Amino acid sequence: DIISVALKRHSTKAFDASKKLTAEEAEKIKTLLQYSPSSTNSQPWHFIVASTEEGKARVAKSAAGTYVFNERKMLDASHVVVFCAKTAMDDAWLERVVDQEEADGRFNTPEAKAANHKGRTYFADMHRVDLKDDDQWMAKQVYLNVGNFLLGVGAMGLDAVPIEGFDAAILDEEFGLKEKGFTSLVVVPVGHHSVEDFNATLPKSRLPLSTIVTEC
Amino acid sequence: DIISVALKRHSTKAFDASKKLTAEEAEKIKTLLQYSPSSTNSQPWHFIVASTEEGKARVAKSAAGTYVFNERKMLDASHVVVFCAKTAMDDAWLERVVDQEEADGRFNTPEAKAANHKGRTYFADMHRVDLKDDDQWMAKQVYLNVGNFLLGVGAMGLDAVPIEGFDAAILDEEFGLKEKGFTSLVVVPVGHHSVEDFNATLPKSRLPLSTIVTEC
Numbered sequence: 001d002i003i004s005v006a007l008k009r010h011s012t013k014a015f016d017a018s019k020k021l022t023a024e025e026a027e028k029i030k031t032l033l034q035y036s037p038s039s040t041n042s043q044p045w046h047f048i049v050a051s052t053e054e055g056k057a058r059v060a061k062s063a064a065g066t067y068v069f070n071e072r073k074m075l076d077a078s079h080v081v082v083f084c085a086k087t088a089m090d091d092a093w094l095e096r097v098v099d100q101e102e103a104d105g106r107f108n109t110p111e112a113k114a115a116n117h118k119g120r121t122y123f124a125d126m127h128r129v130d131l132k133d134d135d136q137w138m139a140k141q142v143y144l145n146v147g148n149f150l151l152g153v154g155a156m157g158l159d160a161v162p163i164e165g166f167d168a169a170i171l172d173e174e175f176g177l178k179e180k181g182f183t184s185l186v187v188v189p190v191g192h193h194s195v196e197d198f199n200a201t202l203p204k205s206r207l208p209l210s211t212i213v214t215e216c
Numbered sequence: 217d218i219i220s221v222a223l224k225r226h227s228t229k230a231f232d233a234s235k236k237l238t239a240e241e242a243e244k245i246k247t248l249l250q251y252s253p254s255s256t257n258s259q260p261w262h263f264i265v266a267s268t269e270e271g272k273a274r275v276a277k278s279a280a281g282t283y284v285f286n287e288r289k290m291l292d293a294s295h296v297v298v299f300c301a302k303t304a305m306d307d308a309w310l311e312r313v314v315d316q317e318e319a320d321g322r323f324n325t326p327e328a329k330a331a332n333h334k335g336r337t338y339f340a341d342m343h344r345v346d347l348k349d350d351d352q353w354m355a356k357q358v359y360l361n362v363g364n365f366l367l368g369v370g371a372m373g374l375d376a377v378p379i380e381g382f383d384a385a386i387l388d389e390e391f392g393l394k395e396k397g398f399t400s401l402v403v404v405p406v407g408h409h410s411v412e413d414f415n416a417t418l419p420k421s422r423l424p425l426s427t428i429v430t431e432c
């Protein structure tokens with residue numbers, strides 16, 4: 001039951017470095033990243049999946065100093081996922097999305113692809129010409145992916161914690177993201193919690209439905 | 217299997233208006249909205265859940281005219297969820313969150329409570345004061361909730377579709393959201409698809425892992 005998963009998943013504060021994901025679980029978490037929905041199927045994202053000791057150490061550099069309370073989570077987890085968003089939405093990216101949709105068989109004619117290209121253009125240029133908030137629009141799609149991801153890994157029986165407490169300028173420079181057209185937004189260590197995870201035994205806390213929900 | 221869910225769920229293009237959620241399902245989708253994670257457990261959100269015909273008609277006003285292609289989806293679904301973000305992070309909301317955490321038993325001393333409140337204020341001030349982007353920061357948490365929600369309702373065997381194609385100004389006015397301190401971001405009709413949901417039999421399409429993932 002997915003509600004049981006939602007009530008039992010929690011943000012892990014400490015990971016057991018000896019408990020690694022299986023090869024099968026490693027493939028499943030990449031499938032989760034890939035198949036998240038996004039506005040107009042824009043998929044405006046890139047993921048760094050660090051599983052070697054050196055790779056995780058490179059990610060953990062972003063937690064040095066002020067964010068040190070997040071550094072050990074990145075070092076001790078089995079896999080660490082860096083969620084990145086595109087910095088600008090270009091036509092080339094939109095062309096590759098619609099061509100992939102054709103390759104996967106979503107169009108029955110060279111007509112319907114011209115209409116899907118016509119549609120995704122009017123939508124994206126609204127954020128590039130007019131609103132000029134396509135940077136924030138793409139980052140929102142990445143946060144949607146994070147929310148999909150956290151529930152999915154919980155359903156797999158894996159522990160995780162989402163992290164905003166890191167230096168994105170440091171992380172971007174370490175992986176050369178800016179020149180690639182990406183910027184890091186959220187880091188998610190994935191693995192199994194240790195006995196030092198004090199948050200595993202604390203009750204969950206949320207505002208009541210009478211506050212957050214209006215029915216009509 | 218949650219991966220089967222991720223590969224099976226789709227954006228429904230048309231809903232069967234005769235098929236309603238059960239009472240138990242209606243409670244479960246509210247639990248999903250409630251228990252989504254968020255940065256510092258800030259829960260900067262409110263949800264309109266329209267299930268009556270008059271309520272759904274009120275939400276559907278935001279799809280009239282320019283966004284007419286989304287209007288029937290709102291009218292036909294069993295339940296329509298409006299995801300709303302706070303427009304500003306005020307100190308009273310932060311106090312409300314920490315008071316709820318105390319009521320739920322997450323602190324063992326009053327000093328533990330004040331320390332948690334001090335930390336949440338510090339990180340909120342990073343967005344309110346330094347970055348001056350708390351409005352975008354809170355919207356990102358709401359998008360994370362949507363991503364959690366879409367996978368959860370798919371795991372319940374329910375159809376849904378996320379919608380950005382609506383007039384948020386019209387929707388905010390219809391429900392007085394701006395004066396209440398909120399703004400609408402995403403509309404999600406939930407129910408069961410009809411024969412007119414052409415997307416139900418199309419294959420899913422995503423960019424390949426060679427493009428979106430870097431392993432290290």
Ligand SMILES: Cc1cc2nc3c(=O)[nH]c(=O)nc-3n(C[C@H](O)[C@H](O)[C@H](O)COP(=O)(O)O)c2cc1C
Pocket residue numbers: 009010011013070161162163164165166186204252253254255256257360
């Ligand atoms: C986007 C985001 C960023 C977060 N950043 C951190 C973080 O930097 N360090 C941390 O320990 N927890 C972080 N959290 C975890 C939250 O404190 C946690 O999700 C919230 O208190 C709800 O608890 P739960 O995840 O156990 O349900 C973050 C959560 C989200 C969604």
Ligand SMILES: Cc1cc2nc3c(=O)[nH]c(=O)nc-3n(C[C@H](O)[C@H](O)[C@H](O)COP(=O)(O)O)c2cc1C
Pocket residue numbers: 036037038039040041144225226227229286377378379380381382402420
């Ligand atoms: C934030 C968001 C907004 C979307 N807005 C619309 C919309 O307004 N109308 C619509 O029919 N589909 C909308 N979609 C659906 C996307 O086109 C769809 O998620 C994407 O093509 C991937 O396909 P899937 O959801 O079937 O996996 C939206 C999706 C997201 C995540």
Ligand SMILES: O=C(O)c1ccc([N+](=O)[O-])cc1
Pocket residue numbers: 038039040041123380381382
């Ligand atoms: O108007 C829009 O913002 C809009 C966004 C997404 C989609 N879509 O994903 O089909 C359509 C319209």
Ligand SMILES: O=C(O)c1ccc([N+](=O)[O-])cc1
Pocket residue numbers: 164165166254255256257339
């Ligand atoms: O952005 C941060 O530094 C940050 C730190 C802690 C948390 N948190 O504990 O949820 C969230 C964000």
